[PDB]
Amino acid sequence: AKILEGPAMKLFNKWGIPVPNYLEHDAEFYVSIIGNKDGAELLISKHGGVDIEDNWDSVRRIQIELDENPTIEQLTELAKDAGFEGEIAERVGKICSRLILCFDNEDAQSIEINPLVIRKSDMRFAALDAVMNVDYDARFRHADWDFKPVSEIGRPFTEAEQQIMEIDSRIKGSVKFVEVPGGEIALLTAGGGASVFYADAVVARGGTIANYAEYSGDPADWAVEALTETICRLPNIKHIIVGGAIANFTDVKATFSGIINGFRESKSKGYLEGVKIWVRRGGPNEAQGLAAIKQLQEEGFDIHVYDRSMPMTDIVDLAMKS
Amino acid sequence: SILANKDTRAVIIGGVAGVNAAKRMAQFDFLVNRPLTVQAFVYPPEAGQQKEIFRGGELKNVTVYDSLAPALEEHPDINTALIYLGASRAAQAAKEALESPNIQLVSMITEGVPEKDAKRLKKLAQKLGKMLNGPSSIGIMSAGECRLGVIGGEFKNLKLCNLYRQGSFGVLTKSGGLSNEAMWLCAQNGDGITSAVAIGGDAYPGTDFVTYLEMFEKDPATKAVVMIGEVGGNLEEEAAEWLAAEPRRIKLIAAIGGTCQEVLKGAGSARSKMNALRDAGAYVPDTFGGLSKEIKKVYEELIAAGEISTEIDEAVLPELPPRVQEVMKQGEVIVEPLIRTTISDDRGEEPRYAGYAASELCSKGYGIEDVIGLLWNKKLPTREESEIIKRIVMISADHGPAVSGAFGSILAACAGIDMPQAVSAGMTMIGPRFGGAVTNAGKYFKMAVEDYPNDIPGFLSWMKKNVGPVPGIGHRVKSVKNPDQRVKYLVSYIKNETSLHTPCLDYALEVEKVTTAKKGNLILNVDGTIGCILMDLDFPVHSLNGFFVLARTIGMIGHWIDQNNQNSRLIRLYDYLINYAVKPEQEVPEK
């Protein structure tokens, strides 16, 4: 979960990592700590800034084993392997110990400082650019986290996007939505795993996805109703993929009741006109769920519902043909 | 099979989610005809309670423990723990389970477990040489042997995926929903699964793909593994490394989600994983749709190489027993009702009293007296019967606080008891001596009219010898010198405002002339009056005391309200009012 430069420096400040007031410097360094299965890896380089892009063999890295944090001594001898010498090596080693304390104690996934600048005259260090990724699931044990996470690697979270994330943290289930600029095929798929395979299916045959959307962990009807509406609103809509694998515990009779109402409310607003809905689903109460979604052809929609016998992502082929 | 087998015995650490998993495991336990996998629950909020879990049609009571230590003390049998607690408690519960010498496998379903916590639990499991599955794992499913979790869905799905017997395919997924799809694909295009493991979708799963592939390689039943991965991290590249390293017995079929290389270097990209696996010798389809074709390829290949036998599913499978109501609707079972009611039906939008809708009676101008007739006689009363019921109820509503019923309510009102309970204590006083002689007055005066028409001394002699005092005759304060205007009013109303012929009342009024000649207080009282009037109206004999019980409840509630409004203190009867005619005091003899 990426966090903005503002909150990142508040956390740096808390752990004594030198930050500019929010300056004229002599040199730029590269410092980063990226978490791994065994703890985290600390990356140091004397060639920071724009200059790191080419000087990758100049980087010295030590693996910090989980809860086995190195001594100020070990870090300062790593600093010396990076090309540092004397006080530069000393204060840099100290910064790293404060960076490890921040990483370990702030449930961080990664911290990247480029440039970490030095004003040699008074040995004033400053973290100029701070790229922090924390594990926001751990928010429950960080009362000082007066911030929300931003988009990992993507544009800022839109109007309908923010609304899906808001209603997500109200129920015990899960509802996710990402807007893809343009695209014909609007996915309304169950489970993260199946959603990704449906998107891959569209891209693979040449198609263009209107969005990314998932609903899992037996979400209450309205949450699925709210996700359905959002997906129907989408530009250039002509195909809706109401997919999913065979659910283990999600009541398909219950979720489909939400989807049916999210479809009725959208077509009444003048959205689902000439839009072919493709349903393929399995799981608890699939018989009732699939029968009730079939019924939307009696009054309204151009719906084509299938059971488990229809391979999962093969509704994408049928949609993209006719 | 690889982790769960017929020797797996579980403890479920969690609440309602844990109980739903246990119910699903019991359905599998029934299908494969094995004893219950869940041995105990650990949930401090419900500690000491027992959970009703059906193994088919048989109810099993599973005990809830405060902590793991007493659970394992009572069930040393347990070797597996399933964590169904929320993120804030799951990692601690998983630590406790891993540190228990009995527990060999810990699986977590929990979502939102901090990466720092999952990393710590993985290292602990490694030190102790134990298996940790998850977090965010739906379960482990071993066909024909064991189900840990909700993995496999509804009972109909267990049958469709042939989960009642071992196949030849292993299943490894990150995604929960996709382990159920892969199980179906193995049943549909192969001979089914051996074991299906959902490793979890978290950044740091407890056990990676290679750890499981090594186990599958050692399982003689597993001939191929269907691995369903996704973009992110490197669990799939290590699997390709494992496969390339040595000539392996098991075939690997792999599908990697995340070929969305259009939306915002990529070391863990879907295409790189597919290439790494494809190069290592794995069966990698271009889309998820091609996965069914790869399974059919491997299956047809293993039968050809004589590793699989084409032995058709000639097994008689158990079916889940339906609920008693379902079987009843179909008339396939006889259920003798516990009770029969003939007076009201609540099953519609509103109650029907003797066939009439309650609100329809209100709208058409009927009253309380009309509802009394419907519920007690199953007939809408006449305007005349109605007018008599109304007066009986109003006249008998209250007779001050000195009477047993009212006094009982006052006593309980002052003892700080709630109204329904206070009034019930007062109503218990209604009987042969106070207000409850209505029925017997009716019976005996009807019998007098029939057996002693012109013989009141005969009736009275018979009553003295056979029942004792005449029900409906006598009063503690009312007498010939102090008349009861309540009875004079009712009698005067029946005689002067109706043209009714009341033989019981007429007889009762004649015996009153004879009894009051013996003792002035032997007057016909309200019980006798109401009893006689109602017998003459031909109301069912059983209903007769109903009029006093209902009328006097108005008074008894009145007294309760009054005592409460006054904030009366507890009553303790004054000493000077008690005659302590007790035994002389004596020392207790030694035993």
> Is B381:B370 a contact under the CB 8 Å cutoff?
yes
- The residue type of A139 is R
> Is A199:A209 a contact under the CB 8 Å cutoff?
yes
- The residue type of A35 is G
Instruction: Residue B13: name the closest of B113, B125, B95, B77 by CA.
Output: B95
Cβ atoms within 10 Å of B259's Cβ, excluding its own: 21
* Gap from A127 CA to chain B (nearest CA, Å): 24
- The residue type of A150 is V
> Is B528:B471 a contact under the CB 8 Å cutoff?
yes
Cβ atoms within 10 Å of B9's Cβ, excluding its own: 19
Structure tokens at B359: 């609100």
| B552 annotated among ligand-binding-site residues | yes
CA–CA distance, B467 with B475 (Å, rounded to integer): 18
Resolution for the entry shown, Å: 2.6
User: Using a CB-CB distance cutoff of 8 angstroms, which residues of chain A are in contact with residue B160?
Assistant: 308
User: Using a CB-CB distance cutoff of 8 angstroms, which residues of chain A are in contact with residue B150?
Assistant: 248-249
The beta-carbon neighbor of B175 closest among A155, A192, A283 is A192
Residue B189 sits at the chain A interface (C-beta within 8 Å): no
Q: Spell B368-388 as b/e; 16+ CB within 10 A means b.
A: ebbbbbbebbeebbeeebbeb
Structure tokens at A171: 């129920």
DSSP 3-state of B141: strand
DSSP 3-state of A219: coil
> Is B233:A169 a contact under the CB 8 Å cutoff?
no
What are the two backbone dihedrals, phi and then psi, of residue B311, each rounded to the nearest 5 degrees? -100, 100
**Four-residue CA torsion sign, B308, B311, B312, B313:** negative
Cβ atoms within 10 Å of B336's Cβ, excluding its own: 4
CA–CA distance, B496 with B485 (Å, rounded to integer): 15
The conformation of residue A136, written as its DSSP 8-state character, comes to G
CA–CA distance, B473 with B469 (Å, rounded to integer): 8
Cα dist from A300 to A90, A272, A277, whole Å: 73, 10, 11
The burial of A124, by beta-carbon neighbours within 10 Å (0-12 exposed, 13-18 middle, 19 or more buried), is given as middle
| B61 annotated among ligand-binding-site residues | no
| B86 annotated among ligand-binding-site residues | yes
Instruction: Residue A281: name the closest of A227, A185, A215 by CA.
Output: A215
User: Using a CB-CB distance cutoff of 8 angstroms, which residues of chain A are in contact with residue B153?
Assistant: 246-249, 282-284
Which ranges of B36-99 does DSSP label H, i.e. alpha helix? 68-74, 87-99
Interface contact A141-B114, CB threshold 8 A:
yes
CA–CA distance, B234 with B238 (Å, rounded to integer): 7
**Four-residue CA torsion sign, A80, A86, A92, A97:** positive
Which ranges of B161-286 does DSSP label H, i.e. alpha helix? 177-189, 209-218, 236-245, 270-280
Residue B258 sits at the chain A interface (C-beta within 8 Å): yes
The beta-carbon neighbor of B177 closest among A154, A194, A204 is A194
User: Using a CB-CB distance cutoff of 8 angstroms, which residues of chain A are in contact with residue B176?
Assistant: 191, 193, 216, 248
Residue B122 sits at the chain A interface (C-beta within 8 Å): yes
Interface contact A140-B173, CB threshold 8 A:
no
CA–CA distance, B273 with B210 (Å, rounded to integer): 14
The beta-carbon neighbor of A191 closest among B120, B150, B175 is B175
| B180 annotated among ligand-binding-site residues | no
Structure tokens at A28: 């730029």
What was the structure determination method? X-ray
| Strand-pair partners of B40 | B11
| B464 annotated among ligand-binding-site residues | yes
The breaks in chain A (C to N more than 2.5 Å) occur after 22
**Sheet of strand A211-216, all strands in order from the earlier edge strand to the far edge:** A174-179, A211-216, A189-190
| B470 annotated among ligand-binding-site residues | yes
CA–CA distance, B503 with B509 (Å, rounded to integer): 10
The burial of A66, by beta-carbon neighbours within 10 Å (0-12 exposed, 13-18 middle, 19 or more buried), is given as middle
- Mutation choice for B interface testing from A248, A250, A317, A320 by most B CBs within 10 A: A248
Structure tokens at B108: 């977590």
The conformation of residue A34, written as its DSSP 8-state character, comes to E
Residue B370 sits at the chain A interface (C-beta within 8 Å): no
Question: What string of H, E and C letters represents the secondary structure of B527-586?
Answer: HHHHHHHHHHCCCCHHHCCHHHHHHHHHHHHHHHHHHHHHCCCCCCCCHHHCCCCCCCCC
* Gap from A120 CA to chain B (nearest CA, Å): 34
Q: What is the DSSP string of B343-409?
A: SEE-SSSS-EETTEEHHHHHHTT--HHHHHHHHHHSSPPPHHHHHHHHHHHHHHS---SSSHHHHHH
